[PDB]
């Protein structure tokens, strides 16, 4: 849940951001929540976990989860903070690795990368829109051509 979300918004949680080029808006508190609830749910179902009094309540206010920890405060000016780390994360590691691989095999998951050109082509002998040769690309600083956005 941490790692996933941190790829949705600009968070300084410790993870590389492989999928940076894949279209995504910078999510808010509220939105993050919504996604996270999905996450939650999936987990639930996968593992036959019907008790909503498990994981549920994690999204009840700023679900910008990074380092979940608890403390005690003593009147003599002091605080005792227990920072409880997770160690092994096999699932998480497998997810990441799945991403890394994804980075190269995106088409398999029907995610195709690039852009299109709209160009007058009529002919008996043509490839596919999936096989470009050299010409479909153009440049800003090209004679007679003008480049607008």
């Amino acid at each position: 849940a941490r790692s996933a979300v941190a790829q949705c918004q600009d968070a300084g949680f410790l993870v590389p951001r492989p999928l940076d080029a894949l279209r995504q808006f910078d999510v808010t508190s509220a939105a993050a929540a919504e996604i996270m609830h999905a996450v939650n749910d999936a987990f639930k179902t996968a593992f036959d976990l019907d008790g909503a009094l498990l994981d549920g309540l994690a999204l009840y206010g700023d679900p910008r989860i990074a380092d979940l920890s608890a403390a005690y405060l003593q009147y003599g000016g002091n605080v005792v903070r227990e920072h409880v780390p997770p160690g092994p994360s096999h699932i998480h590691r497998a997810l990441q690795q799945v991403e890394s691989t994804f980075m190269a095999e995106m088409n398999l998951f029907n995610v195709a990368r690039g852009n299109l050109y709209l160009v007058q082509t009529a002919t008996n002998g043509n490839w596919s829109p999936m096989a470009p040769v050299a010409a479909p690309p153009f440049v800003r600083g090209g004679p007679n051509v003008r480049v607008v956005g």
């Binding site: 808006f25 996604i35 996968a46 997770p86 497998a94 997810l95 799945v98 029907n110």
Partner: protein, 249 residues
């Protein structure tokens, strides 16, 4: 000559490769995986020819009931949970098999999977089972490959009776999925408690009142997924405390 005319018999060379004009890799979690039932969480892609958009109508789409169309800005979103689901639907203990000799009067020997229920997808399971047809693209592939590779290569022989720890058999399988499940089964194994420990545990807890003597036999093929870190319980009970949130109920 389609099929090998073996005297009074026909040996129909069931094509190991898709005999298409066009053939595409397509994600289909557990396509050929006839297990205990199934997760349900099946990441099912249509052929590219059909509108794959369904798969992506997960996240921000609440509002926009545009069946043709995905919100692009929520793509990363879409894809993240999809991947999660692919992971989840693929988390399975790939059970130990029964293996036989190659009974069929082609090249007898090789040790082959006894497929779940019926012998269905064998051509695909084992490319090498397909003899030698003609002079094709299909054939050129088969030509290039060596026979040896298809099948059971090494089976944990040392089995108290015949409880295997692993059968090492090469088959049609996905390197990724495979690697996934291996790390899952690692997880499980690490969690292995012995009933011995449990004795001592429980007993100690009872303040000496009880002894829960547990008989056990010399069986290495036991699996007890119970052991945890204090870290795990603390963090879980953190949740439980949060769970309360000034609700006495």
């Amino acid at each position: 000559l389609i099929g090998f005319t073996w005297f009074m018999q026909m040996y129909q060379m069931t094509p190991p490769l898709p005999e298409g004009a066009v053939n595409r890799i397509v994600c289909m979690t557990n396509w050929a995986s006839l297990g205990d039932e199934g997760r349900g969480l099946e990441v099912r892609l249509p052929p590219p020819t059909d509108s794959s958009v369904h798969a992506y109508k997960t996240v921000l789409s609440r509002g926009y009931i545009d069946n043709a169309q995905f919100n692009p800005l929520a793509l990363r979103s879409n894809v993240l949970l999809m991947l999660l689901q692919f992971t989840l639907s693929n988390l399975k203990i790939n059970k130990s098999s029964t293996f036989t000799s190659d009974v069929t009067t082609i090249t007898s020997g090789r040790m082959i999977r006894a497929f779940e229920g019926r012998p269905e997808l064998l051509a695909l399971a084992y490319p090498g089972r397909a003899v030698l047809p003609t002079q094709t693209k299909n054939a050129q592939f088969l030509s290039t490959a060596i026979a040896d590779r298809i099948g059971r290569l090494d089976r944990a022989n040392l089995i108290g009776g015949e409880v295997s720890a692993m059968v090492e058999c090469m088959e049609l399988c996905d390197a990724l999925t495979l690697h996934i499940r291996e790390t899952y089964i690692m997880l499980l194994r690490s969690m292995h408690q012995d009933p011995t420990q449990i004795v001592q545990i429980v007993n100690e807890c009872a303040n000496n009142l009880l002894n829960s003597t547990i008989p056990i036999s010399l069986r290495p093929t036991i699996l007890c997924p119970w052991f945890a870190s204090s870290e795990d319980l603390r963090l879980q009970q953190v949740m439980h405390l949060v769970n309360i949130s000034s609700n006495t109920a």
